[PDB]
Design a binder for this molecule. Structure first.
Ligand SMILES: Nc1ncnc2c1ncn2[C@@H]1O[C@H](COP(=O)(O)OP(=O)(O)OP(=O)(O)O)[C@@H](O)[C@H]1O
Ligand SMILES: [Mg+2]
Ligand SMILES: [Mg+2]
Ligand SMILES: [Mg+2]
Length: 448
């Protein structure tokens, strides 16, 4: 069945055998790249290798990179807690080939692990390849010997990965595990591995030119595949995250399997706990802008659902220990940051807790008040009060109102923001005008 810490260890040890020097996951905080707030894949730290800038001693490298999908174009923070497959923090596993082997090797080493290493029968496996990429279809169907009906040839939106507007990109291939007949869609056909084939380098005009030395990039979700092997139907039910859920059950008294708006918060605490744990360990302090404000948002949204559960006291600080204990094997580093990070998560809570509550009474007050006078949204002078007078993240104010079906007049919040940038300026983060709303959801009032 393999445990979480067993699958990760089987992955890295397996490819090491395939000539892949095991590398240590870089910190969630990008070293020399101010734009990319948080890492998001195993090829992030090696982005300068595929480019040809760096020349690591090894032509091959495997790693379990710590990822955080809460910024830029890959922002999942919204669906976190609403589904069973979306996390902020998550462990990505993968192999990378720096102009070494290619598709014929990337697949072989990818099929042996899934069948000869994960003990998943080859009768329920499924794969995908870029239709116009007969190169991969041959290896799969002909070489490896897989039936055609079990292979899908999709378009660009499904089988063509790119490293931005310009740079190395190319066709891809995904490995899907069939979960029976009781399920439907991407569930029954859970994506478990993403094999990316850097073949072409898109120029500034959108034209694709081949590379003289192709590359390989793979990203298998640890928690996601762990679900399969652990016969679970939720990434939140794995040996490493469930204890965190029950931790919520115990802090509130509530249990799993009853209401929808309850299982959510439970997943919210457990997930966000992982986020705010490794984050602070990798050098992030709750501030009012950029990275430092992403942790604060994640830590404040946990604070909210916790309060929605009835937990009227700082609790996440107790959850930091559980994480270190569950994650001290692959990342012993956390132990040293345990007490450290424990003081931080406890420091933030006792700071905003009193405000977080007062605010919940304010916001909810203008909710029923609004829907009575027939308003379908919250006024700009209302979401702002909660943003300033209460330090509530603008995204949170939105989620708190979205419950009753109410929205928030964007333009109002827009004008209201100008009514303060002109007021404060008449009677760090710099933001344009009319572009205030494209930054007000990522920076606090005190920093905006
Ligand atoms: N938030 C997440 N929580 C859990 N697993 C994830 C998450 N994001 C990605 N994964 C897993 O990591 C694998 C590699 O990431 P990839 O970039 O292919 O994801 P994706 O294209 O966003 O697909 P998906 O829609 O299933 O998240 C995915 O196939 C999936 O198994
Ligand atoms: Mg996705
Ligand atoms: Mg996909
Ligand atoms: Mg994918």
């Amino acid at each position: 069945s393999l445990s979480a810490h067993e699958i990760r260890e089987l992955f890295l040890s397996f490819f090491e055998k395939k000539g892949h020097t095991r590398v240590k996951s870089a910190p969630l905080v990008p070293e020399n790249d101010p734009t990319l707030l948080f890492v998001n894949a195993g090829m992030v730290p090696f982005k300068n290798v595929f480019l040809g800038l760096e020349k690591r001693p090894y032509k091959r490298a495997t790693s379990c990179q710590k990822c955080l999908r809460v910024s830029g174009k890959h922002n999942d923070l919204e669906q976190v807690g609403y589904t069973s497959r979306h996390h902020t923090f998550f462990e990505m596993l993968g192999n990378f080939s720096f102009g070494d082997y290619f598709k014929k090797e990337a697949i072989e080493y990818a099929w042996e692990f899934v069948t000869e290493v994960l003990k998943l029968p080859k009768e329920k496996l499924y794969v995908s390849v870029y239709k116009d990429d007969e190169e991969a279809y041959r290896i799969w169907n002909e070489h490896i010997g897989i039936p055609s009906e079990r292979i899908w040839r999709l378009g660009e939106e499904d089988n063509f990965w790119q490293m931005g507007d310009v740079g190395p990109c190319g066709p891809s291939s995904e490995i899907y595990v069939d979960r029976g007949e009781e399920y439907e869609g991407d569930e029954r056909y859970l994506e478990i591995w993403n094999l990316v084939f850097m073949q072409y380098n898109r120029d500034e005009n959108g034209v694709l030119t081949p590379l003289p030395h192709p590359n390989i990039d793979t990203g298998m979700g640890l928690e996601r595949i762990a679900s399969v092997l652990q016969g679970k139907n939720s990434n939140f039910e794995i040996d490493i995250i469930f204890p965190l859920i029950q931790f919520g059950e115990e802090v509130s008294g509530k249990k799993y399997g009853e209401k929808f708006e309850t299982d959510v918060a439970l997943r919210v605490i457990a997930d966000h706990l992982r986020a705010i744990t490794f984050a602070i360990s990798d050098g992030v302090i709750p501030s009012n802008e950029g990275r430092g404000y992403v942790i604060r948002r994640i830590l404040r949204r946990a604070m909210r659902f916790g309060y929605k559960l009835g937990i009227e006291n700082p609790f996440l600080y107790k959850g930091v220990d559980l994480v270190v204990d569950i994650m001290k094997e692959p990342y012993p580093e956390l132990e040293l940051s345990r007490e450290f990070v424990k003081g931080i998560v406890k420091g933030e809570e006792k700071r905003f807790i009193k405000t977080l509550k007062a605010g919940m009474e304010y916001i909810q007050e203008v909710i029923q008040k609004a829907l009575e006078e027939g308003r379908k949204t919250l006024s700009g002078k209302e979401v702002f009060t909660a943003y300033d007078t209460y330090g509530f993240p603008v995204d949170l104010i939105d989620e708190i109102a979205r419950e009753k079906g109410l929205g928030i007049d964007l333009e109002g919040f827009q004008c209201e923001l100008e009514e303060q940038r002109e007021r404060a300026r008449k009677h760090p983060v710099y933001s344009h005008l009319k572009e205030l709303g494209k930054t007000s959801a990522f920076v606090g009032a005190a920093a905006l």
